[PDB]
Amino acid sequence: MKDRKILNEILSNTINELNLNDKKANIKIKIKPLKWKIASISLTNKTIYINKNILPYLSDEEIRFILAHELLHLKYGKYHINEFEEELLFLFPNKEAILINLINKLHQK
């Protein structure tokens, strides 16, 4: 139902808003069923995999947040440093009070 064309548009808009440099900007997105993960990234395949099973629950704004969180790890590394938090709060201002709980709950065991 949720086509790869809107998904690719959301990814491209989030990369642009985050001003990801040339190599960090070379990322694909693909729909694949996952194992209790909203999203994951294959750093070698240079692909963000969004879970096919939970994709019907996701609004465009929810996808944008999930992709921004993942994309910001490409830019800043594996930790939620101050610059990570600031950039995510700039893209999502009305999420100040829930931001850290959400990003912490997006990491696997």
| Cβ-based nearer residue to Cl ion, 41 or 91 | 41
Distance, in Å, from the CA atom of 50 to the CA atom of 77, rounded to the nearest integer, reads 20
Tokens, residue 91: 């893209």
* Binding of residue 103 to Zn ion (CB under 5 A): yes
Question: What one-character DSSP code corresponds to residue 49?
Answer: E
Select the residue interacting with a second copy from 15, 18, 65, 67 (CB under 8 A).
65
| Element containing residue 12 per DSSP (H, E) | helix 4-17
* Binding of residue 85 to a second copy (CB under 8 A): yes
CB distance 55 to 32 below 8 Å: no
* Binding of residue 56 to a second copy (CB under 8 A): yes
Which string of x and - marks every residue 15-54 that binds a second copy (by CB under 8 A)?
Answer: ------------------xxxxxx--------------xx
